[PDB]
Write an enzyme that holds these catalytic residues in place. Structure first.
Site, PDB file in Angstrom:
ATOM      1  N   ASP A 124      41.510  34.876  35.518  1.00  0.00           N
ATOM      2  CA  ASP A 124      40.273  35.740  35.794  1.00  0.00           C
ATOM      3  C   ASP A 124      40.134  35.506  37.201  1.00  0.00           C
ATOM      4  O   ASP A 124      38.944  34.817  37.820  1.00  0.00           O
ATOM      5  CB  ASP A 124      39.275  35.392  35.259  1.00  0.00           C
ATOM      6  CG  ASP A 124      38.119  36.213  35.185  1.00  0.00           C
ATOM      7  OD1 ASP A 124      38.127  37.308  35.672  1.00  0.00           O
ATOM      8  OD2 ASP A 124      37.251  36.241  34.237  1.00  0.00           O
ATOM      9  N   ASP A 172      35.302  32.305  40.761  1.00  0.00           N
ATOM     10  CA  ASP A 172      34.666  32.024  39.288  1.00  0.00           C
ATOM     11  C   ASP A 172      35.533  30.886  38.813  1.00  0.00           C
ATOM     12  O   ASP A 172      35.774  30.900  37.558  1.00  0.00           O
ATOM     13  CB  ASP A 172      34.804  33.322  38.503  1.00  0.00           C
ATOM     14  CG  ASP A 172      33.850  33.541  37.197  1.00  0.00           C
ATOM     15  OD1 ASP A 172      33.042  32.674  37.319  1.00  0.00           O
ATOM     16  OD2 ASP A 172      34.221  34.271  36.547  1.00  0.00           O
TER      17      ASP A 172
HETATM   18  N1  LIG Z   1      45.456  31.917  27.097  1.00  0.00           N
HETATM   19  C1  LIG Z   1      45.093  32.715  27.809  1.00  0.00           C
HETATM   20  N2  LIG Z   1      44.095  33.437  27.606  1.00  0.00           N
HETATM   21  C2  LIG Z   1      43.858  34.422  28.453  1.00  0.00           C
HETATM   22  C3  LIG Z   1      44.689  34.481  29.330  1.00  0.00           C
HETATM   23  N3  LIG Z   1      44.170  35.916  30.168  1.00  0.00           N
HETATM   24  C4  LIG Z   1      42.786  35.849  29.298  1.00  0.00           C
HETATM   25  N4  LIG Z   1      42.725  35.181  28.491  1.00  0.00           N
HETATM   26  C5  LIG Z   1      41.651  34.943  27.756  1.00  0.00           C
HETATM   27  O1  LIG Z   1      40.687  36.249  27.766  1.00  0.00           O
HETATM   28  C6  LIG Z   1      39.393  35.523  27.952  1.00  0.00           C
HETATM   29  C7  LIG Z   1      38.666  36.665  28.868  1.00  0.00           C
HETATM   30  O2  LIG Z   1      39.675  37.007  29.793  1.00  0.00           O
HETATM   31  P1  LIG Z   1      39.004  36.911  31.397  1.00  0.00           P
HETATM   32  O3  LIG Z   1      40.028  37.289  32.514  1.00  0.00           O
HETATM   33  O4  LIG Z   1      38.220  35.630  31.737  1.00  0.00           O
HETATM   34  O5  LIG Z   1      37.766  38.125  31.416  1.00  0.00           O
HETATM   35  P2  LIG Z   1      36.407  38.236  31.251  1.00  0.00           P
HETATM   36  O6  LIG Z   1      35.851  36.662  32.117  1.00  0.00           O
HETATM   37  O7  LIG Z   1      35.815  38.223  29.792  1.00  0.00           O
HETATM   38  N5  LIG Z   1      36.032  39.579  31.876  1.00  0.00           N
HETATM   39  P3  LIG Z   1      35.801  40.197  33.287  1.00  0.00           P
HETATM   40  O8  LIG Z   1      36.712  39.090  34.472  1.00  0.00           O
HETATM   41  O9  LIG Z   1      35.869  41.400  33.711  1.00  0.00           O
HETATM   42  O10 LIG Z   1      34.043  39.555  33.358  1.00  0.00           O
HETATM   43  C8  LIG Z   1      39.643  34.404  28.486  1.00  0.00           C
HETATM   44  O11 LIG Z   1      38.434  33.554  28.293  1.00  0.00           O
HETATM   45  C9  LIG Z   1      40.594  33.809  28.015  1.00  0.00           C
HETATM   46  O12 LIG Z   1      40.120  33.401  26.540  1.00  0.00           O
HETATM   47  C10 LIG Z   1      45.819  34.366  29.773  1.00  0.00           C
HETATM   48  O13 LIG Z   1      46.367  34.486  30.308  1.00  0.00           O
HETATM   49  N6  LIG Z   1      46.079  33.012  28.857  1.00  0.00           N
HETATM   50  N1  LIG Z   2      26.185  29.378  30.401  1.00  0.00           N
HETATM   51  C1  LIG Z   2      25.002  28.720  31.123  1.00  0.00           C
HETATM   52  C2  LIG Z   2      25.534  28.577  32.288  1.00  0.00           C
HETATM   53  O1  LIG Z   2      25.684  29.785  33.118  1.00  0.00           O
HETATM   54  C3  LIG Z   2      26.454  29.683  34.528  1.00  0.00           C
HETATM   55  O2  LIG Z   2      27.492  28.862  34.223  1.00  0.00           O
HETATM   56  C4  LIG Z   2      28.632  29.889  34.097  1.00  0.00           C
HETATM   57  C5  LIG Z   2      28.667  31.078  35.059  1.00  0.00           C
HETATM   58  O3  LIG Z   2      27.762  31.973  35.061  1.00  0.00           O
HETATM   59  C6  LIG Z   2      27.918  33.220  34.073  1.00  0.00           C
HETATM   60  O4  LIG Z   2      27.118  34.251  34.183  1.00  0.00           O
HETATM   61  C7  LIG Z   2      26.903  34.964  33.004  1.00  0.00           C
HETATM   62  C8  LIG Z   2      25.655  36.084  33.402  1.00  0.00           C
HETATM   63  O5  LIG Z   2      26.053  37.321  34.244  1.00  0.00           O
HETATM   64  C9  LIG Z   2      26.607  34.008  31.976  1.00  0.00           C
HETATM   65  O6  LIG Z   2      26.909  34.141  30.838  1.00  0.00           O
HETATM   66  C10 LIG Z   2      27.404  32.496  32.692  1.00  0.00           C
HETATM   67  O7  LIG Z   2      28.370  32.286  31.797  1.00  0.00           O
HETATM   68  C11 LIG Z   2      30.183  31.770  34.987  1.00  0.00           C
HETATM   69  O8  LIG Z   2      30.339  32.438  35.836  1.00  0.00           O
HETATM   70  C12 LIG Z   2      31.190  30.522  34.804  1.00  0.00           C
HETATM   71  N2  LIG Z   2      32.554  31.139  35.004  1.00  0.00           N
HETATM   72  C13 LIG Z   2      30.812  29.467  33.689  1.00  0.00           C
HETATM   73  C14 LIG Z   2      29.748  28.886  34.187  1.00  0.00           C
HETATM   74  N3  LIG Z   2      29.577  27.674  33.504  1.00  0.00           N
HETATM   75  C15 LIG Z   2      25.171  28.817  35.297  1.00  0.00           C
HETATM   76  N4  LIG Z   2      25.453  28.796  36.657  1.00  0.00           N
HETATM   77  C16 LIG Z   2      24.953  27.447  34.799  1.00  0.00           C
HETATM   78  O9  LIG Z   2      23.913  26.705  35.202  1.00  0.00           O
HETATM   79  C17 LIG Z   2      24.424  27.583  33.416  1.00  0.00           C
HETATM   80  O10 LIG Z   2      24.492  26.142  32.525  1.00  0.00           O
HETATM   81 MG   LIG Z   3      36.155  37.410  35.328  1.00  0.00          MG
HETATM   82 MG   LIG Z   4      36.447  34.836  32.442  1.00  0.00          MG
END
Ligand SMILES: Nc1nc2c(ncn2[C@@H]2O[C@H](COP(=O)(O)OP(=O)(O)NP(=O)(O)O)[C@@H](O)[C@H]2O)c(=O)[nH]1
Ligand SMILES: NC[C@H]1O[C@H](O[C@H]2[C@H](O[C@@H]3O[C@H](CO)[C@@H](O)[C@H]3O)[C@@H](O)[C@H](N)C[C@@H]2N)[C@H](N)[C@@H](O)[C@@H]1O
Ligand SMILES: [Mg+2]
Ligand SMILES: [Mg+2]
Ligand SMILES: [Cl-]
Length: 293
Positions: free
Chosen positions: A207, A188
């Site tokens: 993440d 991701d």
């Molecule tokens: N600065 C910072 N932000 C963090 C850190 N870990 C998590 N975050 C914040 O927490 C938010 C959610 O974290 P994340 O691991 O991406 O989990 P999630 O994508 O929402 N949940 P899941 O992976 O279960 O779908 C991130 O967008 C970021 O803003 C970290 O180590 N540093």
């Molecule tokens: N938010 C719109 C965009 O969604 C998707 O892209 C995101 C992508 O997709 C997420 O899937 C969610 C719905 O389950 C969504 O909420 C997404 O965040 C995500 O996994 C990435 N970490 C961030 C990406 N930019 C698409 N692949 C992209 O084409 C589209 O423009």
């Molecule tokens: Mg995640």
């Molecule tokens: Mg995340």
């Protein structure tokens, strides 16, 4: 409702981690099924009401990765059927965005791209025997999702919707992009998970919740994406050049197939989690894509 959700999570943290005292706690992020909290301006606590795989991955990577790039190091974990909590020290930095990237010098940009390519090269190169349970077959997952469509809502879709799905499945069947190198991928790897230090260099990545042994091409799907959330195709292309030994056209084909799949992925998520609005959104997205000139 800000202040109440936080009280309950403060309670759960103190209940499940005996010596842990919560002095401050705020929401920093949330998915549709999870919420993340910054506790004591020092710890991230990811929580879900249904993280064992994610923990196994951090534990595997903190043992085996040779890198200066920081990743979550799990200090607190509670995992049960109805509740999961992971806690680790917040990695400090600023998240990469398009706006930040456009203000970087050509050289600053190049160094960031090299840092990324280098991290991916190191992760994709790991002997993954010790996490071999974490395999993911995207093609087969799609075939299984398609069967679930056929067993549930497919017959009530419009013809336009059905043509989009069939046309995707025709492409899935013809493609070769699932037949290449498998390795451990972040899976991701978008710029909202990449942290920069004060010199705009890659300092952390977060993440790894979807990580697994999967096609090498997977970690380039967002680096290649053309959208407001991501930097751009050229970013992904140069990263691919720096990473080396990888067919760029097939990386792009892979990315393009996954992008075509997004609305169906959205529909499937709606079926599996009994959330009608996702079914509606994915179908609507099909019409939008079908009518773009
Ligand atoms: N600065 C910072 N932000 C963090 C850190 N870990 C998590 N975050 C914040 O927490 C938010 C959610 O974290 P994340 O691991 O991406 O989990 P999630 O994508 O929402 N949940 P899941 O992976 O279960 O779908 C991130 O967008 C970021 O803003 C970290 O180590 N540093
Ligand atoms: N938010 C719109 C965009 O969604 C998707 O892209 C995101 C992508 O997709 C997420 O899937 C969610 C719905 O389950 C969504 O909420 C997404 O965040 C995500 O996994 C990435 N970490 C961030 C990406 N930019 C698409 N692949 C992209 O084409 C589209 O423009
Ligand atoms: Mg995640
Ligand atoms: Mg995340
Ligand atoms: Cl609907």
């Amino acid at each position: 409702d800000n202040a109440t959700n936080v009280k309950a999570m403060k309670y759960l943290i103190e209940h499940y981690f005996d010596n842990f005292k919560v002095d401050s706690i705020e929401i920093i992020g949330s998915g549709y099924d999870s919420v993340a909290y910054l506790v004591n301006n020092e710890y991230i606590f990811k929580t879900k009401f249904s993280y064992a795989k994610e923990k196994a991955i951090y534990n595997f990577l903190n043992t085996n990765l040779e890198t200066n790039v920081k990743i979550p190091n799990i200090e607190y974990s509670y995992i049960s059927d109805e509740l999961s909590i992971l806690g680790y020290k917040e990695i400090k930095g600023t998240f990469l965005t398009p706006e930040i990237y456009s203000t970087m010098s050509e050289e600053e940009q190049n160094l960031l791209k090299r840092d990324i390519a280098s991290f991916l090269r190191q992760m994709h190169g790991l002997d993954y025997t010790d996490i071999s349970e974490c395999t993911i077959d995207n093609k087969q997952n799609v075939l299984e999702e398609y069967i679930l469509l056929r067993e549930t809502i497919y017959n009530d879709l419009t013809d336009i919707e059905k043509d989009y799905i069939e046309s995707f499945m025709e492409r899935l069947n013809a493609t070769t992009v699932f037949e290449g190198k498998k390795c451990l991928c972040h899976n991701d790897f978008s710029c909202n998970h990449l942290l920069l230090d004060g010199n705009n260099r890659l300092t952390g990545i977060i993440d790894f919740g979807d990580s697994g042994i999967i096609d090498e091409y997977c970690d380039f799907i967002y680096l290649l994406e053309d959208s407001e959330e991501e930097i751009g195709t050229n970013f992904g292309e140069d990263i691919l050049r720096m990473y080396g030994n990888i067919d760029i056209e097939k990386a792009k084909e892979y990315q393009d197939i996954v992008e075509e799949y997004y609305p169906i992925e959205t529909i499937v998520y709606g079926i599996k989690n009994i959330k009608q609005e996702f079914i509606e959104n994915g179908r609507k997205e099909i019409y939008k894509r079908t009518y773009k000139d």
